Design a binder for this molecule. Structure first.
Ligand SMILES: *[C@@H]1O[C@H](CO)[C@@H](O)[C@H](O)[C@H]1NC(C)=O
Ligand SMILES: *[C@@H]1O[C@H](CO)[C@@H](O)[C@H](O)[C@H]1NC(C)=O
Lengths: 94, 91
């Protein structure tokens, strides 16, 4: 199936502008947060901080990335993120 | 002769797709050669380890029939290949 899929992905990313969020002019993007804490490694009274390790998962919907043909969820190489739009989520107090 | 056979391997190669993308899972073989444990901290409850971490898998997209020997390419080929997303859970 491998050739069929490269095309469906290539078309997804043909003309895709990473500068624009989903629904650029339209309604806001509902972004779903999901955290799986691995560990708190350290707690400093001296510096009044703590060090945290987590899996930080985000779910959102970009209609530009829909595919009908294929019958499974597509796990692509991590490097695709560089050519996708992702939410500008940061940690205010880090 | 060889530059072409390599160039054709990587013509149209999608790094986004694993081997057998829709198909069965990829058996990845692990092989570790420990060089040293440099430190063990009871205070931070960690240790520092140095290893050679080798991985073997099979990408049929990278088969070459003509040549009868194993091709060591420059390390920079990795950037234009698919590699497994192996990490260390507890690092
Ligand atoms: C793809 O993900 C959805 C969750 O949105 C899940 O219900 C579905 O079973 C997944 N597909 C496969 C092939 O497991
Ligand atoms: C080439 O790779 C095969 C498969 O691992 C191995 O058996 C063989 O020894 C290698 N060739 C040389 C010249 O060592």
């Amino acid at each position: 199936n491998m050739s069929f899929v490269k095309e469906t992905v290539d078309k997804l990313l043909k003309g895709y502008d990473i500068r624009l969020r989903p629904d650029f002019g339209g309604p806001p993007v509902c972004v779903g947060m999901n955290i799986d804490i691995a560990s708190i490694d350290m707690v400093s009274e001296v510096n009044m901080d703590y060090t945290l390790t987590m899996y930080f998962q985000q779910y959102w919907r970009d209609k530009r990335l829909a595919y009908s043909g294929i019958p499974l969820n597509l796990t692509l190489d991590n490097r695709v993120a560089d050519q996708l739009w992702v939410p500008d989520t940061y940690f205010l107090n880090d």
